[PDB]
């Protein structure tokens, strides 16, 4: 089996997996919609009671299976639990990261296209009226991805966006095709430091923004000023948990796959904690101190919150660059922003495609070259669905990137810490660890976490089961139909891999 060269490269590769678009786009939106500081309390708690324990759990499961030559859940779920149904559940460890990858890589190609256009200086040019400043950039984005005037089902991506997507795929391939140590690790040691530098620079530059409408300090205050009136709102807890799952790459089967390349004897405790810690630092300190403070600086808190609620991409691709264009060298500053997003996304995209690649290598015994090329072909082809079908992206991000990750997170925890045995799991986690997991986390993993997630899923299911059936748009049905087809396809591959063994 292939292994990580150094401990540092391992940390940066894992950090690269977690730290991504979720930090600089998803988080700011989530924190702003839930009342800033009010969102921080449930967020930290969710990080302690869910993020950390699951992180360690995924690392352990990854290394455990990796020792036997299996990096994907279909095989690992079977090693921990002997059953056909264990393999079927394991299919999600491929389905989720593949589905997510389909639209994630497209969003990534956006930041690249924007990065390129902002570098060359091809951007809209605003003249004191907020709408007259934002409109040009809204029209810019809509011209790029091909947004319809009314609410029409069809998208019309510009030739450029399409070509940029091809290029993005090519970049993802050139990195993945070189393997774990030569491809991902090498790039991690570069991308990450660069990412951190750009982030710090942007945070500082943004912190210097002060206008008659407010300052960046007002945004930092808003985000870090506690509010206990929102602690009774379940939605805030749900959003915080969802964010923790998405930002830490939990339930994507990505962490497990990456962990399967960790030598059986190497530590996974201190390594995992470091990766997760690096992600939170990059999330709350960096990600939360760029977008939000900037919007609050120019448009004040009320408007900033309004803009955050407006959409997930509205703050990142429209509002922020619009704000920069009003400052000296704002065009180049926008370039740095989109270059930051691109690297963060690139380090993450290669992580959610790896599970698929690792399954082809491990279970179907395909060479690394073929596995990567086929995985790229699949994602690229499937991507057309997100490119040309409106609301398709949201559907995939919901079923896979929201509901699926939590369900899968609960499933993997139940399989590892209950069925496989709590003591055996605990001993497997601490084995070879430079430091040891606090004894208390044994009862967080076994009791607190699964209960919290179970409750969360029940609540979710109750609200979504009626809405699903009554949904007018056909685009969403096509999407559901197709992703379901993907699931069958993967289940069929798992079947073939199972027969080859015999």
Instruction: State the number of binding residues for ligand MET (CB under 6 A).
Output: 15
Q: Does 347 bind Na ion (CB under 5 A)?
A: yes
- Smallest separation (angstroms) from ligand MET to the CB of 338: 15
Q: Does 22 bind ligand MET (CB under 6 A)?
A: yes
CA gap 239, 312 in Å, rounded: 14
CA gap 497, 500 in Å, rounded: 5
**Stretches 21-29, 264-272, 427-435, 488-496: which one binds ligand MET (CB under 6 A)?**
21-29
Q: Residue 254 binds which one of Na ion, ligand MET, none, with CB within 5 to 8 A depending on kind? A: ligand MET
- Smallest separation (angstroms) from Na ion to the CB of 194: 12
Strands (E) in 116-184, as ranges, are none
The burial class, CB within 10 Å (0-12 / 13-18 / 19+), for 190 is exposed
Using alpha carbons only, give the angle 462, 464, 470 rounded to the nearest 5 degrees: 125
Binding-residue pattern over the window 411 to 440 for Na ion, x denoting contact by CB under 5 A: ------------------------------
Q: Does 356 bind ligand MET (CB under 6 A)?
A: no
Beta bridge partners of 389: 154
Q: Does 30 bind Na ion (CB under 5 A)?
A: no
CA gap 190, 185 in Å, rounded: 9
Q: Does 168 bind ligand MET (CB under 6 A)?
A: no
Q: Does 351 bind ligand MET (CB under 6 A)?
A: yes
Q: Does 109 bind Na ion (CB under 5 A)?
A: no
Among residues 29, 164, 220, 254, which is the contact residue for ligand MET, using CB under 6 A? 254
Question: Which residue carries 């059953």 as its tokens?
Answer: 83
Question: Which residue carries 């279970």 as its tokens?
Answer: 363
Name the token pair of 414: 């139940």
CB atoms within 10 A of CB 283: 26
84 annotated ligand binder: yes
Using alpha carbons only, give the angle 188, 266, 272 rounded to the nearest 5 degrees: 55
Q: Does 47 bind ligand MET (CB under 6 A)?
A: no
**Stretches 172-180, 186-194, 247-255, 438-446: which one binds ligand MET (CB under 6 A)?**
247-255
Q: Does 20 bind ligand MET (CB under 6 A)?
A: yes
**Stretches 38-46, 337-345, 430-438, 474-482: which one binds Na ion (CB under 5 A)?**
337-345
Q: Does 261 bind ligand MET (CB under 6 A)?
A: no
CA gap 106, 380 in Å, rounded: 9
CA gap 375, 356 in Å, rounded: 7
Direct distance between the N- and C-terminal alpha carbons of the chain, in angstroms, rounded to an integer: 21
Among residues 348, 375, 390, 479, which is the contact residue for Na ion, using CB under 5 A? 348
**Stretches 12-20, 67-75, 295-303, 457-465: which one binds ligand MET (CB under 6 A)?**
12-20
Q: Which of 378, 334, 314, 9 is nearest to 172 (CA)?
A: 378
Q: Does 347 bind ligand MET (CB under 6 A)?
A: no
Q: Does 20 bind Na ion (CB under 5 A)?
A: yes
CA gap 353, 112 in Å, rounded: 19
Name the token pair of 233: 């709102």
- 247-261 core/surface letters (b: 16 or more CB in 10 A; e: else): bbbbbbbbbbbbbbb
Q: Which is nearer to ligand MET, 352 or 396 (CB)?
A: 352
- Smallest separation (angstroms) from ligand MET to the CB of 104: 5
Work out whether the CA dihedral 259, 261, 179, 385 comes out positive or negative.
Answer: negative
Name the token pair of 21: 């678009």
Binding-residue pattern over the window 77 to 116 for ligand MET, x denoting contact by CB under 6 A: ---------------------------x------------
Q: Which is nearer to Na ion, 196 or 489 (CB)?
A: 196
Q: Does 249 bind ligand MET (CB under 6 A)?
A: yes
- Smallest separation (angstroms) from ligand MET to the CB of 111: 12
Q: Which of 62, 63, 90, 85 is nearest to 75 (CA)?
A: 90
Among residues 140, 246, 298, 359, which is the contact residue for ligand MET, using CB under 6 A? 246
Q: Which is nearer to ligand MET, 314 or 349 (CB)?
A: 349
Q: Does 240 bind Na ion (CB under 5 A)?
A: no
Q: Does 23 bind Na ion (CB under 5 A)?
A: yes
Rg (CA), the chain: 22
Residue 210 backbone phi and psi in degrees, to 5: -140, 125
- Smallest separation (angstroms) from ligand MET to the CB of 397: 10
CA gap 247, 282 in Å, rounded: 10
- Smallest separation (angstroms) from Na ion to the CB of 346: 7
Q: Does 252 bind ligand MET (CB under 6 A)?
A: yes
Question: Which residue carries 């690096």 as its tokens?
Answer: 278
- Residues making up the annotated binding site are 84
- Residues making up the annotated binding site for phosphocholine are 84
């Amino acid at each position: 089996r292939e292994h990580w060269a150094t401990r540092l490269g391992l940390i940066l590769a894992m950090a690269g997996n977690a730290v991504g678009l979720g930090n600089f786009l998803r988080f700011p939106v989530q924190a702003a919609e839930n009342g800033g500081g009010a969102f921080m309390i449930p967020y930290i708690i969710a990080f302690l009671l869910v993020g950390i324990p699951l992180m360690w759990i995924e690392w352990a499961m990854g290394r455990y299976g990796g020792a036997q030559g299996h990096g994907t859940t279909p095989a690992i779920f079977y090693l921990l639990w002997r059953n056909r149904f264990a393999k079927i559940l394991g299919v999600f460890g491929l389905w989720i990261p593949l589905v997510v990858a389909i639209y994630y890589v497209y969003i990534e190609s956006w930041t690249l296209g924007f990065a390129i256009k902002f570098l060359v200086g091809l951007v809209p040019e605003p003249p004191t009226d907020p709408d007259s400043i934002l409109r040009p950039f809204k029209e810019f984005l809509y011209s790029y991805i091909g947004v319809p005037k009314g609410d029409e089902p069809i998208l019309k991506p510009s030739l450029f966006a399409y070509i940029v997507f091809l290029i993005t795929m090519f970049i993802n391939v050139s990195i993945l095709i070189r393997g774990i140590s030569k491809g991902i690790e090498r790039f991690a040691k570069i991308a990450m430091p660069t990412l951190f530098i750009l982030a710090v620079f942007l945070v500082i530059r943004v912190f210097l923004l002060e206008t008659p409408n407010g300052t960046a300090a007002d945004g930092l205050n808003f985000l870090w000023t506690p509010d206990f009136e929102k602690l009774k709102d379940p939605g805030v807890w749900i959003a915080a948990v969802g964010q923790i799952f998405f930002t830490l790459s939990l339930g994507f089967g990505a962490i497990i796959t990456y962990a399967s390349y960790v030598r059986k004897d190497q530590d996974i405790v201190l390594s995992g904690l470091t990766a997760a810690t690096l992600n939170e630092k990059a999330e709350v300190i960096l990600g939360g101190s760029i977008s939000i403070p900037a919007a609050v600086a120019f448009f004040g808190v009320a408007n900033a919150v309004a803009i955050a609620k407006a959409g997930a991409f509205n703050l990142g691709f429209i509002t922020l660059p619009a704000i920069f264009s009003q400052t000296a060298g704002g065009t180049f500053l926008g370039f740095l922003w989109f270059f930051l997003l691109f690297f963060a996304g690139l380090t993450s995209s290669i992580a959610i495609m790896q599970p698929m690649i690792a399954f082809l290598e491990d279970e179907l015994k395909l060479s690394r070259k073929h596995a990567v090329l086929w995985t790229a072909a699949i994602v690229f082809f499937s991507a057309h669905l997100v490119m040309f079908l409106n609301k398709s992206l949201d559907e995939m991000d919901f079923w896979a990137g929201t509901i699926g990750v939590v369900f899968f997170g609960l499933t993997e925890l139940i399989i590892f810490f209950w069925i496989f045995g709590a003591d055996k799991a605990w001993e497997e986690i601490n084995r070879g660890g430079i430091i040891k997991v606090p004894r208390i986390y044994y009862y967080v993993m076994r009791y607190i976490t699964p209960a919290f997630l179970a409750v969360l899923l029940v609540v979710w299911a109750r609200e979504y089961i009626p809405k699903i059936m009554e949904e007018t748009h056909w685009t969403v049905w096509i999407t559901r139909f197709y992703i379901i087809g993907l699931f069958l396809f993967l289940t069929f591959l798992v079947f073939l891999a199972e027969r080859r063994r015999n």
